[PDB]
Amino acid sequence: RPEWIWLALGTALMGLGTLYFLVKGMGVSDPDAKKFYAITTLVPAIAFTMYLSMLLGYGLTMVPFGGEQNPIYWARYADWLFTTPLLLLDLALLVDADQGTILALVGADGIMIGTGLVGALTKVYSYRFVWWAISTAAMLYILYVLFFGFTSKAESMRPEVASTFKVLRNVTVVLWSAYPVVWLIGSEGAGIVPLNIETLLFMVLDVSAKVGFGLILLRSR
Amino acid sequence: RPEWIWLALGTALMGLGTLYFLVKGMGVSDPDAKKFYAITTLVPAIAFTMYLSMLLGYGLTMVPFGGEQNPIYWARYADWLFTTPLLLLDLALLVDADQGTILALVGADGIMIGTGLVGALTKVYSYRFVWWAISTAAMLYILYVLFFGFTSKAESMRPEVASTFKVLRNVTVVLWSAYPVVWLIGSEGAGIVPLNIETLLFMVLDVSAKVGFGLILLRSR
Amino acid sequence: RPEWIWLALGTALMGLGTLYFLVKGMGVSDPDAKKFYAITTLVPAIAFTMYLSMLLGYGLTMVPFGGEQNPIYWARYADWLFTTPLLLLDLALLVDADQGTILALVGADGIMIGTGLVGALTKVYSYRFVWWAISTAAMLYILYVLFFGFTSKAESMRPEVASTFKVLRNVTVVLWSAYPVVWLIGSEGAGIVPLNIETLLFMVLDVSAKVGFGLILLRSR
Ligand SMILES: *C/C=C(C)/C=C/C=C(C)/C=C/C1=C(C)CCCC1(C)C
Ligand SMILES: *C/C=C(C)/C=C/C=C(C)/C=C/C1=C(C)CCCC1(C)C
Ligand SMILES: *C/C=C(C)/C=C/C=C(C)/C=C/C1=C(C)CCCC1(C)C
Structure with a gap:
């Protein structure tokens, strides 16, 4: 399938974006700046790793459904499993949040990725959609905790902090909305948009969120 | 098997108890109160999720043993894997504990659930019992860290704190004792008590611990 | 295979070393000392658990490669998955480190064990080596964060702290170097050194690192 030219493209970018934040953060003496550079460079590194497994083949196993065996891309749920909490912990660290607030976000996020995978690998039943909905x-x-909650706390900060969070939250809400759209439309969902294109859309939102988020946030607060 | 009328019953309650703490905690402005509401609502939510997987079928795979294939309910070990540390972290957060104390509890708990599963899915050998013992x-x-350790620290607090912890520890020790009893007696163990009843007993202790713990603790400290 | 007399030997020692730190730490009233005893006794306990699974057989599944089915010892990647971050968190706790510093170490370590396993269970392709390299x-x-980074911070402490860290870092760098050597030379890699001997080498470095590290650090700071 031509999807290899999208995995290949991704692994290239994610890996490069990792090598990029790796050399930029080599100077950070400050603790807080050192900290943000920690999360932000940890998320792209993982993306590369999984994208390699995805391309090479490890992260691809045929799963029954209906009457035919379909191309499951479970490695995506491994990337997302860690990549996601780190990106949320990132924002909450910026816009000084509560342990209750961060522990719950990452808690509901963990349910987000896990419930997602469960339905991505559901035996064969059209019960997949129920998990999608969960x-x-x-x-x-x-x-909701992101948009409305944090912004209020974003007002308790200097213009830089309120600004970076602004763009970051924008990018974060928009990108995270397109994901479940691409999922339902493609493989796991109906099959309307083929895997080739689905894998492109996901690779696009993936390179977008993780590297964009990095570049925008990394811009000195 | 009639066990579906126990999974169905559970998923109903766990999900409702989740929706309940979800609406009660919507008002918590205070940080500490916000925090406890975080753990306490995170544990029931997970229980529901897994109970759905349990009912729908995902969390049920046939495993060899002796000469016949038996009904393994591994999803229980997924629920317990997270649900449990959160409930312990809950109590230790109330009765102000040490990083050493909480990190070790959750450490020995993680060995509790993992060792448990290993023997729950042991190939076929009667080596299951050895893991049970571990x-x-x-x-x-x-x-032990719960009962004797914390109570002493429960005396360094106001009557409310010493009280809630009292009942909570009571409920926690009692319920956690019946669990390994139901395990040895049923499926994974001997087979004395059928799965129908075992699944009821587990669903009872499950709805009991998680929702009861929530209602009792949630009662303002 | 005679490798059972190495797993048996290991499970014996790891379990004993666990029982040893368990009785020594029963007196620690101090918080910080209590804390270090927490990590240090948690790592050996896990080693035993997995070494039991390794010996009993659970942690051994035949995997295709080339044309013949090979003896994969995945349980090692379960031990290492947790045992390792705990040992790093240990050192960083001693030589007062940053959240950025500890979160990144454990982050790159998690990539260390995961990437390792991925290639340990790679379908059959000689793509195993690529993961080895990652x-x-x-x-x-x-x-690098260990050696050069921490030592500098080791100079901001009393002679005890600079001393224990000295030996600990020495033992840690040396032992952690022999590991990938034993891996490439044996099973997962080429097949030069048989599993019998490989399992001995790994059991040696395992009993060495975890119990030695414990004895050396546990020596009052
Ligand atoms: C770097 C990668 C990021 C930020 C990935 C985010 C992924 C999601 C927010 C995925 C959400 C999903 C659902 C809501 C349902 C279907 C499954 C997912 C994972 C596509
Ligand atoms: C909400 C669920 C809770 C609090 C579940 C707790 C479960 C246990 C304490 C289970 C303990 C077990 C053993 C000691 C051995 C056999 C396996 C278990 C999981 C039944
Ligand atoms: C108690 C056990 C310890 C400290 C184990 C440490 C193991 C390692 C540092 C392993 C490293 C590896 C590689 C770098 C590549 C091949 C796979 C490993 C796990 C052998």
Whole structure:
């Protein structure tokens, strides 16, 4: 399938973006700046790793459904499993948040990725959609604590902090909305948009969120 | 098997108890109160999720043993894997504990659930019992740091704190004792009590611990 | 295979070393000393658990490669998955480190064990070596933050602290270097050194690192 030219493209970028933040953060003496550079460079590194497994083949196993065996891309749920909490912990660290607030976000996020995978590998039943919906519920709570909650706290900060968070939250809500759209439309969902294109859309939102988020946040607060 | 009318019953309650703490905690402005509401609502939510997987079928795979294939309910070990550390972290957060104390509890608890699963899915050998015993050892240490350790620290607090912890520890030790009893007696163990009843007993202790713990603790400290 | 007399030997020692730190730490009233005893006794306990699974057989599954099915010892990647971050968190706790510093070490370590396993269970392709190399990269970063980074901070402490860290870092860098050597030379890698001997080498470095590290650090700071 031509999807290899999208995995190949991704592994290239994610790996480069990792090598990029790796050399930029080599100077950070400051603790807080050192900290943000920690999360932000940890998320792209993982993306590369999984994208390699995805391309090489390890992260691809045929799963029954209906009457035919379909191309499951479970490695995506491994990337997302860690990559995601780190990105949320990132924002909450910036916009000084509560242990209750961060522990719950990452809690509902963990339900977001896990519930998602469960339905991604559901035996064969069209019960997949039910899990999709549970993930939707979860993601709705996530973008609520993010949007409305944090912004208020973003007003307790200097213009830089309120600004970076502004763009970051924007990018974060928008990108995280397109994900479940690409999922339902493609493989795991119906099959309307083929895997080739689905894998491109996901690779696009993936390179977008993780590297964009890095470049925008990394811009000195 | 009639066990579906126990999974169905559970998923109903766990999910409702989740929706309940979800609406009660919407008002918590205070940080500490916000925090406890975080753990306490995170544990029931997970229980529901897994109970759905349990009912729908995902969390049920046939495993060899002796000469016949048996009904393994591994999803229980996924629920317990997270649900448990959160409940211990809960109590230790109330009765102000040490990083050494909490990190070790959750450490021995993680050995409690993992060792448990290993023997729950042991190939076919009657080596299952050995793992059971290791879990017993682990759980003994757990109820020791809980009972004797924390109570002493419960005396350094206001009557509310010493009180809630009192009932909470009571409920926690009692319920956590019945669990390994139901395990040895049923499926994974001998087969004395059928799965139908075992699944009821587990669903009872499950709805009991998680929702009861929530209602009792949630009662303002 | 005679490798059972190495797993048996290991499970014996690891379990004993666990029982040893368990009785020594029963007196620690001090918080910090209590804390270090927490990590240090948690790592050996896990080693025993997995070594039992390794011996009994659970942690051994035949995997295709080339044309013949090979003896994969995945349980090692379960031990290492947790045992390792705990040992690094240990050193960083001693030589007062940053959240950025500890979160990144444990981050690159998690990539160390995961990437390692991925290639340990790679379908059959000689793509195993590529993952080996990624692990090498990861481990290189790890021993860099350890060696050069921490030592500088080791100079901000009393002679005891600078001393224990000295020996600990020595033992840690040396032992962690022999590991990937034993891996490439044996099973997962080429097949030069048989599993019998490989399992001995690994059991030696395992009993060495975890119990030695414990004895040396546990020596009052
Ligand atoms: C770097 C990668 C990021 C930020 C990935 C984020 C992924 C999601 C927010 C995924 C959400 C999903 C659902 C809500 C339901 C279907 C499954 C997912 C994972 C596509
Ligand atoms: C909400 C669920 C809770 C609090 C579940 C707790 C479960 C246990 C304490 C289980 C203990 C077990 C053993 C000691 C050995 C056999 C396996 C278990 C999981 C039944
Ligand atoms: C108690 C056990 C310890 C400290 C184990 C440490 C193991 C390692 C540092 C392993 C490193 C590896 C690689 C760099 C590549 C091949 C796979 C490993 C796990 C052998």
